[PDB]
Each structure stands twice: as C-alpha cells, then as structure tokens.
Amino acid sequence: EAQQNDIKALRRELELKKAKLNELHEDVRRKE
Amino acid sequence: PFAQALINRLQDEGDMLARKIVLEMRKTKMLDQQL
Amino acid sequence: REVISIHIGQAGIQVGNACWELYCLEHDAFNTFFPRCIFLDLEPTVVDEVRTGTYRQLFHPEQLISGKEDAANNFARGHYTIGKEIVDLALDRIRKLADNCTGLQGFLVFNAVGGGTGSGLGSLLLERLSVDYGKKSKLGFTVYPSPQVSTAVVEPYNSVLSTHSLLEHTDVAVMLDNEAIYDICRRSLDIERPTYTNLNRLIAQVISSLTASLRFDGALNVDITEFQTNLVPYPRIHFMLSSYAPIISAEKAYHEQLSVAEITNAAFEPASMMVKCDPRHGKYMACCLMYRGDVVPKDVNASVATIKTKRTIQFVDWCPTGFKCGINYQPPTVVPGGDLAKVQRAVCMISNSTAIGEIFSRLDHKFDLMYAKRAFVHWYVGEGMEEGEFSEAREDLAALEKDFEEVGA
Amino acid sequence: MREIVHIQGGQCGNQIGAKFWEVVSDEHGIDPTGTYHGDSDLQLERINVYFNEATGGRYVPRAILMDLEPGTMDSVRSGPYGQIFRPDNFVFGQTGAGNNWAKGHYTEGAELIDSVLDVVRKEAESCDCLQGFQVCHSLGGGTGSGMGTLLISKIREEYPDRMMLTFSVVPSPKVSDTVVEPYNATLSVHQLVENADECMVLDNEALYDICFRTLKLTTPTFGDLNHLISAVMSGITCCLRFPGQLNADLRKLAVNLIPFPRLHFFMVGFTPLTSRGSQQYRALTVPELTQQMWDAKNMMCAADPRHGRYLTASALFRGRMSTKEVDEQMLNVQNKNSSYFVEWIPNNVKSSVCDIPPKGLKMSATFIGNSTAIQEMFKRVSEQFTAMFRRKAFLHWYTGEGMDEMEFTEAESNMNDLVSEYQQYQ
Amino acid sequence: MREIVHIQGGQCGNQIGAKFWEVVSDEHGIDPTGTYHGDSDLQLERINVYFNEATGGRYVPRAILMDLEPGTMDSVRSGPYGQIFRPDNFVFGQTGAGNNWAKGHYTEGAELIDSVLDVVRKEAESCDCLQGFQVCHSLGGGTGSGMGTLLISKIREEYPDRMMLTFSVVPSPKVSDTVVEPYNATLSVHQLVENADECMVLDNEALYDICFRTLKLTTPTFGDLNHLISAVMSGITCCLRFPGQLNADLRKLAVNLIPFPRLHFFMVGFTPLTSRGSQQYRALTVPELTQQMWDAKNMMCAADPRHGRYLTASALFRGRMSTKEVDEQMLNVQNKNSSYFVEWIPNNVKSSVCDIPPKGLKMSATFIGNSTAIQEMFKRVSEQFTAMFRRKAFLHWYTGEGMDEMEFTEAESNMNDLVSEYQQYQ
Numbered sequence A: 001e002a003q004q005n006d007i008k009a010l011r012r013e014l015e016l017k018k019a020k021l022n023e024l025h026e027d028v029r030r031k032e
Numbered sequence B: 001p002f003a004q005a006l007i008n009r010l011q012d013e014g015d016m017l018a019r020k021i022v023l024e025m026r027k028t029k030m031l032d033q034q035l
Numbered sequence C: 001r002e003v004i005s006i007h008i009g010q011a012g013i014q015v016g017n018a019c020w021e022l023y024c025l026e027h028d029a030f031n032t033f034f035p036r037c038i039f040l041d042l043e044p045t046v047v048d049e050v051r052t053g054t055y056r057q058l059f060h061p062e063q064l065i066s067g068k069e070d071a072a073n074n075f076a077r078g079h080y081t082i083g084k085e086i087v088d089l090a091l092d093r094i095r096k097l098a099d100n101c102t103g104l105q106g107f108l109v110f111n112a113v114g115g116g117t118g119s120g121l122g123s124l125l126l127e128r129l130s131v132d133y134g135k136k137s138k139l140g141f142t143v144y145p146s147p148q149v150s151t152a153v154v155e156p157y158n159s160v161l162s163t164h165s166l167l168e169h170t171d172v173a174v175m176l177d178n179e180a181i182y183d184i185c186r187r188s189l190d191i192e193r194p195t196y197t198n199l200n201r202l203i204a205q206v207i208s209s210l211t212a213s214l215r216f217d218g219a220l221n222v223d224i225t226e227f228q229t230n231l232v233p234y235p236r237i238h239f240m241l242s243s244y245a246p247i248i249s250a251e252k253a254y255h256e257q258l259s260v261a262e263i264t265n266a267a268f269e270p271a272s273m274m275v276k277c278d279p280r281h282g283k284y285m286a287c288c289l290m291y292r293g294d295v296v297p298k299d300v301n302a303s304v305a306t307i308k309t310k311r312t313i314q315f316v317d318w319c320p321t322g323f324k325c326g327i328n329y330q331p332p333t334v335v336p337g338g339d340l341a342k343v344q345r346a347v348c349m350i351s352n353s354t355a356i357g358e359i360f361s362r363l364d365h366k367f368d369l370m371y372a373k374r375a376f377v378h379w380y381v382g383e384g385m386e387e388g389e390f391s392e393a394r395e396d397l398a399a400l401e402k403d404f405e406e407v408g409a
Numbered sequence D, E: 001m002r003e004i005v006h007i008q009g010g011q012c013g014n015q016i017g018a019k020f021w022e023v024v025s026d027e028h029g030i031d032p033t034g035t036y037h038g039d040s041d042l043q044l045e046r047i048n049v050y051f052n053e054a055t056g057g058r059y060v061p062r063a064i065l066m067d068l069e070p071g072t073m074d075s076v077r078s079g080p081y082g083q084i085f086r087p088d089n090f091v092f093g094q095t096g097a098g099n100n101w102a103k104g105h106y107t108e109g110a111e112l113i114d115s116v117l118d119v120v121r122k123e124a125e126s127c128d129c130l131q132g133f134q135v136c137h138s139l140g141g142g143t144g145s146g147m148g149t150l151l152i153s154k155i156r157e158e159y160p161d162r163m164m165l166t167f168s169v170v171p172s173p174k175v176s177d178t179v180v181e182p183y184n185a186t187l188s189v190h191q192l193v194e195n196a197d198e199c200m201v202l203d204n205e206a207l208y209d210i211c212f213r214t215l216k217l218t219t220p221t222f223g224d225l226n227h228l229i230s231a232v233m234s235g236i237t238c239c240l241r242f243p244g245q246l247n248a249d250l251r252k253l254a255v256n257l258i259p260f261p262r263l264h265f266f267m268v269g270f271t272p273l274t275s276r277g278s279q280q281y282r283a284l285t286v287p288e289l290t291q292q293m294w295d296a297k298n299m300m301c302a303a304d305p306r307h308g309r310y311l312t313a314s315a316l317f318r319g320r321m322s323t324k325e326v327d328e329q330m331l332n333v334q335n336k337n338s339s340y341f342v343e344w345i346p347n348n349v350k351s352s353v354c355d356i357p358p359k360g361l362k363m364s365a366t367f368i369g370n371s372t373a374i375q376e377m378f379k380r381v382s383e384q385f386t387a388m389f390r391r392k393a394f395l396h397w398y399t400g401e402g403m404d405e406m407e408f409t410e411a412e413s414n415m416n417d418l419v420s421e422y423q424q425y426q
C-alpha cells in the first residue's frame, strides 16, 4: 500500500511540473 | 512488484523535467534583457 | 474573346459557387463567360449540392463532373490511383469547350494544394493541358496552407509535392492563405466569426476585377497576356501577392472618403495582403494595379509617384518603372447577402517580390521534420510513390530559395 | 454511393448494434415498420449508405447479426426496431462458446464462419461502391471476440483494399466480469494489430465513470452505455450521410491520424454531455465543446491521455459553425499545452465540419486521439496475463482445444513489442 | 470587459450572497427563471460583469458557493432566485470543520481547496479582462475563516496583479456566538494583512444597532442584515455597470484610499436607510445624504472613528445629481471638523457620482472611510486572545491538528505590531 501512495504522489508532482513547463514555453513563444 | 519499477521511471522522469524547467527559466530571463 | 474556368476539389468548386454567382449577377460583354466552366471532384457530396441547389437549370448537366470516391487528403491517391480514371473524361470535355470557343485567351484553374484532389489531380490536369495547348495561358489561383492556422496534418507533404508541378505548368500563380483572409475579415470587415462562405465571396471580387478589362471598355484595358509580360521577370518566378481595397463594411464605407490616393496606399500595407507574409522583408520586383469604376488617369498617376518616393517599402534596383496600371469604367457589383458595400471605385493589386521566399522557407522545416522520421510516408508509398520523389521535391524547393535570394540581390 | 456494411458479433455486439440501428433509423426518419416517414428532403438521398430499398418503400438495414446463443436473437427480435431486419441475415449457430476464446476461434467458429461469409458476400456485392465494413464486438467474451476476430481476418483476405472499422471494448481489472479476460484480450489484440484498419478502443470503467460524473445518472444500465457508444458511431460516419463545409470520410481520417501502420488504436469521446438538470444552464458554443472534448476525464477508455503524449488528434464537428473558430480553438490547445503533444509533428489536430446536427441537438463533436498513453493498458493487461501463464492457470481449457504454448508466447511477444513502439514514439 | 468573479464561503457567506444575487438580478431586470424581461436597453449593456448568457435569455450568475455542510446548499436552492445558479458551481465538502480554524485551514481545506480552485479557474478564464475577485465570509466561524483565507492566499499567488475585495464580519464580545472567536479572528487577520488588497470590516453588533434605531424594525431576522450588506456591495460596484458624470472603479478607489500597503481595513456605511414611519417626512438632497452618511451611528462597524483620525474617506453617489453640490458638501464636512482628519493630507475625500439609482429610491449614496480608529477592534480582540493563550485554553484542538505554539506567537506579534503601526500614523 505504501508504494501505491508513492505512485500517486510522484505523478501529481510530475503533473504540476509539466504544467509549469508549458507556461514557460508559452511565454517564450509570446516574447519571441 | 511492478510498482517498484514504476517509481524508478517516475523519479528519473521528474528529475529530468526539472532540468528542462531550469534551462527554460534562463532562456526567458535571457530574452527579457534583449527586450 | 472568352476565357473558361476550371474548378477542382472541395475548395475549388465552393470558390466557383461564389464566383459564378457574381458573374450572373454582374451581367455582348457576357460572351466571355456565357457557362464555360467545369466542376470536378472525387467526392460527389459538394458537386451534387450544386445539382439540387438554386442553380439547377443554370449549369448543363454534363458539366458537373463527379467521381465515385474521394482521394482523402492523399496526393498520391489523387494523382496516381484515382485521378487516372477521371482526368481523361474531364480534359476530353474541356477540349470541346475550347472548340466551342474561337478567341480563347486562356484557362483559369481554382484549387487548394492542401488536399488530395485539389493538389494531385490539379497537377495531373495541368500536365495534360500544358502538352495539349502549350501557348494558351492558364492562370492558377491556388490556396496554400497557412503557417499557424491549419486544418489537416499531412498538408506539408501535399504542398511540396504539388508545388513541384505548379512551377513549370501554370503561367501566373496567385497565392492565397486562410489566416491572412481571416485577418482581413477580422480587421477591415470586423467579422469576428467568419466562415468559408465570406472568404469565397471576396476571392471572387479579385477574380472579377482582373477579367473586367476584357468584359467592359475602360480608359486603359489590360488582357491576360499583359500580366504575362509585365509582372514575371524570369520564367520560373511567377508567384504573386494579392491585395484589394477598399475591403470595407456597409456603414464604414459611407463614413469614410474613399479616393484614389489612399486606396493606392491601403493596397500596399501588409495589413491588407491576401497571403500571410511581410513584404517589408522583401523588395518589390513589379506591381500591377487594376482600377475599377470612377478613375481618371491623373490621380492613379499621382499615387504611384508617392509610393515610389516613400521609403517604408523598397523596390529592386532593376526597375525604375516598376508598375503596370490599368483602368476600367464599370464599378464593382454587389451581392445581396454580401458584406462589401457599394463603392464608386476599387483597386486590386497583384505584385511580385521576395517576401514569398519566406513562405517556402517556413514550409521547408515542417515538411523536413516529418519526413526525417518517415511519418505518414507509408500511406503515399503504398499508393504508388517512392522515396525518390519526396527527396527530389525537397531539393526543388531548396533551389527555389537560392533562386529568390540570388535575384533579390 | 459509398457503402457501409454492418456486422455485429456476440451478445455485446448485438445489443450495441440494436441501440445503433434505433438511432440511425430515427435520423433517417424511418419508422419501426420500415417505411419512410421523415420530413426533410436531406434524409432521403443518403440512406443507401445504410439501407436497401426492398419493395413498397421497405428500407431494410444492411446489417448482419452474429452469435452462438439464441437469447440475444430473441431479445433483438422482441423489441422495437427488431422487425426491420431481414430474417435471413440472422446467421446463428446453436451450441455456444461461453467465454472460451478457443471455442469461438477454432471449434465452433469452424461451422458458422461459412454461413456468415455467404451472407456478407451477397450483401456486399448488392451495392456498387463499397466504402467498408463496420464491426462491433468485445475482447473479453468468446463468441464475440474469437468469432468476430476470425471474421475480420477472413474479410481482410478477400477485400484487402476496402476500409474496416472496429468498435471493440477491452476488459479492465476494475470491472472484471470473467476470469479468463487476460487470456482472451491478449490473443484478440494479436489478431487486431495485423487485420483491422483502425480500432476505436472502449471500456466499461470510463463509461460507468462518465455516467456517474458528467451525466450523473442514478442507474446506468447497459441501455445508456450502449446509447453513448452508438452516438460515437453515428458521429464518425456523419460525413458520408450529410453535406458539410469540409468533408472527411473514413479513409481521410485514417491517413491523418495513423503515422505508422501498427499505431491504430484510438481513444474516443463525445460532446456535449450534460446532466438533465443543467442542460439549460449552459451555452452552445465551439469553445464550450472544446473544453469538454480535451478533458482527460472524458475519454471512453480507462487510459488517462495526460499520462503520455498525443501523436495526432481529430475533431468532427456537426452544426452551423464558423470554421475560423474551429481552427483557432485547435491551435490554442496546441500551443498552451505544448508538452503533451509530440514535437516532430506540427499540426497534430485534423478537423472537419458537417452541416447536419444529430436529432435533438444544435452542435456536437467527436474526438479521436491517437495517444501514446494507450500503452498503459497493454502493460496493465500483460502483467495479468503473465501472472496466469507463469503457472498455467486455466490453460488446459484452451490447450485441449488446439492452442499450444507457442501461441501464448507469441501473444506476449506481440503485446511486448507493441508497448515498446508506443514508448519509442513518446 | 471589466469583470468580477464572486466567491461565497461558509454559512455566513451563503446567506449574504443569496440576498445579494436577488438584488443585482432585480436591478438588471432578470426574473427568477433567469430570463431577461426588462425594458431599458441600458440594463443589457453591462451584464458581462456579473453574468453569462446561456441560451434564450438565460443569464447565469458568475458566483461560486463553497461550504462544508449541505444545509446551506439546500437552503440556497430552495429560496427564490435559487434556480439561477449553475449547479456545478456548488463546490462542496461533506465532513464539516465546525468553528475550528485549524480544521478549516489544515485538515479539510487540503482536499476541498483544489476543487474550489479549479472552479475559480474556469470562471476566471471564461471571461476576458478580470477586474478582481469578490469574497464574502466571516471571521468567527471555521469553514469561512480558515478555508476562505486559504483560498485568498492561493488565489493571490496565482493572479497577483488583480484586485480583490473581501467583505468580512468580525466577532465582538457583545455578539459572541462561538467561544473561540479570538483564536479564529487573530489568525485570520494575520493572513488578511499579508494577502488581501483591501478588506471591508463589518460586524453584527452595528447591524443590530442599525436595525433598531434607523430601520426601526420589529423583528430583524438575518434577511434584513443581509439586505443591508447586499445594498453596500451593489453600491460600490455600481460604477462599472452604469455610466455617470464621474466614474470611479475599484482600482481607482483602492489607490485613492490606501496610503500604505498595510493600512487596508475600511469601515462602511450606506444611505439612505430610514424606517417606513419616517421615510414619508424626508427630503432627497445632497446635504441630507451627507449628514446621514458621516453620522457615527450609521457606520457598519463598532469602531467609532472620532476615537481616532481619518486618513482618507470616499463617497459613491448614485442618481441624477449636481457635481458642484457633491464637492461642496465634502468640503464643508472636512473644513468644520478639521481635527477628525489627518493633517498631512489635504482633501481627504474621494468622490464619485453615477447616474442610475437603485430601484425604490430617487437618490442614494455609499460611504467608505479608511480611519485609524479601526485599531479599537484589534486591541479589543487581542486581549481576549491573550486571556486564553496565557493559560493554554482550548489549545489542544488547534495543536493536535498540525499547528504548533510559534504560530500563535507569530500571529500575536503581527496583530500587535499592526495596531502599533496604526497608532504611529495616528
């Protein structure tokens, strides 16, 4: 059960990081 | 069982994404001077 | 004197469905059009909308050609597999249309290069027309895909593979995007939510303004053979930016004071080009100005002087007389349900420059990226193609880029 | 003109197809007695794609029901829109496989597949320009999966140029009805990767989850789930049946969403889907349809697309709408969420617009994303398959029927090499 | 174009917001069904600020209800104008905090606030140009104070460049509904001074005083209190919805009334507010609105400003008025009582006029004063906080949830230096 919690935490962190990355990419496109 | 390998894949991918995020912050900070 | 029009594809005959509506509404002057047309497509759905539409009796039943099944956004399918059975029937009709004619100025073709029918059998029709007549002009008003606004996925493959034949087959090729026209309808026509119908209506305005010299008597007439000399300085450089003025609504038109000086200016700003490209990066090789309606030669003469003396735009070092004017007396007509107000006078400008060299370069990367990983290539190869023609069409556009850079210097 | 022959297999296929012919017959305005009674002219000129005029205005569907148990046939014949089929088309065995893939693929199929092929051939050449076949079946059952899969292989041998759609449901461990689900689904996929043209993957978790969260139904029986699947199937072949400002047939969608020949497993979604209590609290615009389309909690598969990247995507719109709004919305989602899309492919979204909405609605949409998140289920299945096959559970029920150990190893091999190629292209 | 998204938290927030949406919808001529039935074209020009057109005249409010117990949600849908809210905007927990700021800020907030954030995101991106957010809540309760304050902090780090109003009633010893009021108020104010752009102090004691003397009501239920608060909220944002001779937007008010980033606690009053027995004997001119505005017994807080000094003040007038009269009245009340005003700022009063009165009156006004006397509440609350915390009363319900002791000491220090810093500029 412990490893299951690790899975559902790492994906959520991974998801937040991917969303931040998209924001940065969008800003570069607008600024260029 | 197989979740033990899933945690490795997810951990390594998360760390690599941080490296991409870091480089992108320098890129936008570099263009902001040129503006 | 007559000129016949061919329409290919979903985009071609919808453009024609608006273009012929304008011709009938506009009309011995009719002799050049009355129709001398042919619709042809692989999908029967859009042609048979005409067969049951309001213009049932207007078109002779045979004219409306229609295949059995679509090429499905597949240049190879619409050029090698399915084209081979319908193209022969089409051109073996167009011949007897020309035999009906006596003083044929030329043909004019309408196609979009993104699709399979507009691109594939477009080029196939063009190749048998060039070997059959050769000398007679074939004006091709094509619709290239926009850089950022796009509806398909494999359209880079189609656009490159279509262009390789559009070079050495058509005589005068006018680019038209969809984003640029969308921007025109958003900016000037203030239509925030446009559809394909509005685009096709103002495309017909451009076509009508360049054939009105044959149809009606003006102060300075200009035939289709005239564009052949006055705008193409080299046999393989014929790609024309288009523009129109005044594109204006029904209320704004009355408020503003339309004249010759300001519309000659408005037809030169990149905020009014029919192709998404910035001619500030390029240098004008030649310009052509069709004036319709209430025009005396003095103010058109004065207007080209002010353009030459401005420095916001530049010309090539080769042409001091870099213009070709043309004046016709009859004003542009309006369509009920159309958005363009009635104007005493309008200007359709067709230029040639090196800004077009940017669109091909922009196109190259998108095609290059997909081709390197061999995306979607298995569809075209199983249709009948090989890796040879992909790579060789690629290097043809590479040569064209160097060509524009060399001539522009 | 273009022709679609319908083939339904098994209990799942028959009941899904029953609801399908209900909604298509209403769209074309045909009564339960078989006669035309519609109002608009538009509904007449394109009924040959799905029907055949028999005599006295009798339009019979071009369908083939196929199973091994008579309960499904009698339930079909009992209900409304049950007396519109030709009784000769109810090709029907008698013994029954019963969740044994070997029975439905080697023993019992061997005496039925001859009769179905006779009917489908006579029904195929009855029309002039075939567009393709349309199959609805499952991958957990035996007579649906095994016989339907064998029928797919034989059909692709005879007609190798014609198109092929397969609406197949796959089993998931959260909704696990039979015990031998992995043994069936793994072998079934082995044949689907080489025989079908494209497969629109379905599942019951997402369907039950959709009716809970978005539809907020209280008792979602199979009728409502089959109603949703039918609405998807009507949306995918609306372009043939009705004129539009931009048409996209079956072949047109296939070439724009399949970048490599083995990458033909799709995810599906339908919009708009709103609760009955909130149907009047909403607008009907293109942006609203797009927000509900690209929601990851709206696919009809239990595979979150945000767990991977989209290779391509497709949006079929129905209704009077502006094409500019269509392209701007697709471009907007392509720029803001840049990481979820593949990079060496620009324009991962093909779009199309038809001018006739489904009955009762103003504007609808159908999404078909070919993503690389679909590989999780194949891994999600293969781990179960190995769990049984490491220790030969239930294996003799198939071994004493003809399958040898190499067949299961081959099925594992094909499953494993497939999940690697999805991982490769991500 | 300029847009306000509305957020209601807890039981206090739900009743206040309920009577608020009735008042605005009645001003814009929208009936309980939610369809337009007004007459003037002027009422339609500025409905984008608070509503979205759904279909066929249906206007839905741009509000989000957020709580923890379903009694408030069902009481909202029961009453009139209850059928206008979109049911999806009822984002909602199930367990209940119950007057425990730690339960409202650490345990139940951590799983509800992601949901309320997602609704707010959709509501913010659904519109084009945000003017600000509007949050109504209390400071004594738990599900309003702790959760709402966490929502404020989360939103401020998301959209940092937009305004934000929060209308908060605060506890007082004379109206003491719960026992841990100071432990909730002190921690809530600590977060408000560092997150919110501007706050509007309210209390229930002053509202009861208003209903006794000015309204002369027999039975002042909560409906009338919410009626007064709603009239104030409509009065301040009237400038964005209607044109006038001198328009003053929310940002224009914020920069004109806040001299220093920590001095953003205002006391509010509204005029005219008269009993039905004396409403017949009254006149409607500018001086009668002012001398009822600037009366100390009309403020909606129990902080008498003449026990302090005015920094700045503002009046928002509604109705066809003469701007000369408006300015000379502000001049008169500032010249006579010069001691009550700050000295190093001349012309302490910002004034504005709008040309649309509320229905039922010919001329009205709304007063917003940023005095320094608001520190009476801070000392008045902090001593009760100290009286329990010196002796560790009720502490374990806060401590055993995740909070430690330095949180209370830091909160004490920040509240204490805040009242100290108000006193220095005084």
Ligand SMILES: Nc1nc2c(ncn2[C@@H]2O[C@H](COP(=O)(O)OP(=O)(O)OP(=O)(O)O)[C@@H](O)[C@H]2O)c(=O)[nH]1
Residues within 6 Å of the ligand: C008, C009, C010, C011, C012, C014, C015, C041, C042, C043, C070, C071, C072, C073, C074, C112, C114, C115, C116, C117, C118, C119, C143, C145, C151, C152, C178, C196, C197, C199, C200, D245, D246, D247, D252
């Ligand atoms: N201006 C304009 N462009 C159109 C219109 N219809 C389609 N297009 C363009 O056509 C391109 C695709 O080709 P289509 O004409 O739709 O289809 P096709 O050329 O007949 O090829 P197939 O789909 O295989 O039949 C798209 O990129 C559109 O931009 C139209 O009505 N007006």
Ligand SMILES: Nc1nc2c(ncn2[C@@H]2O[C@H](COP(=O)(O)OP(=O)(O)O)[C@@H](O)[C@H]2O)c(=O)[nH]1
Residues within 6 Å of the ligand: D009, D010, D011, D012, D013, D015, D016, D098, D099, D138, D140, D141, D142, D143, D144, D145, D169, D171, D177, D178, D204, D222, D225, D226
């Ligand atoms: N959506 C839907 N799924 C069904 C229906 N009937 C059966 N299923 C699914 O089919 C699977 C069993 O397939 P089965 O009916 O035994 O196939 P068959 O025996 O080969 O005909 C189960 O997982 C069910 O969830 C139905 O009417 N609708």
Ligand SMILES: Nc1nc2c(ncn2[C@@H]2O[C@H](COP(=O)(O)OP(=O)(O)O)[C@@H](O)[C@H]2O)c(=O)[nH]1
Residues within 6 Å of the ligand: E009, E010, E011, E012, E013, E015, E016, E098, E099, E138, E140, E141, E142, E143, E144, E145, E169, E171, E177, E204, E207, E222, E223, E225, E226
């Ligand atoms: N003005 C007004 N105040 C209210 C109303 N209902 C509750 N309150 C106030 O709310 C305070 C208690 O907060 P509570 O409702 O328990 O907040 P919550 O539990 O966090 O939602 C009391 O001091 C009341 O004065 C109302 O209808 N109007």
Ligand SMILES: [Mg+2]
Residues within 6 Å of the ligand: C009, C010, C011, C043, C115, C116, C117
């Ligand atoms: Mg087409």
